[PDB]
Specification:
Elements: E1 14-16, E2 40-42, E3 48-50
Antiparallel strand pairs: 1-2, 2-3
Length: 54
């Protein structure tokens, strides 16, 4: 659960979590290693990165 730098990770585009809508195509500023519990962070080029873990 080692929360990395909250900054934008070049591989990471967007992510979903328990109760988190938003379209699955938006390269916002976020990261997986930072992320949150039970989340799922994916890239925008159609390639999943990894699941968050706060």
């Amino acid at each position: 659960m080692k929360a990395c730098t909250l900054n934008c990770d070049p591989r990471i585009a967007y992510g979903v979590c328990p109760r988190s809508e938003e379209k699955k195509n938006d390269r916002i500023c976020t990261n997986c290693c930072a992320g949150t519990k039970g989340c799922k962070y994916f890239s925008d080029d159609g390639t999943f990165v990894c699941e968050g873990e706060s």
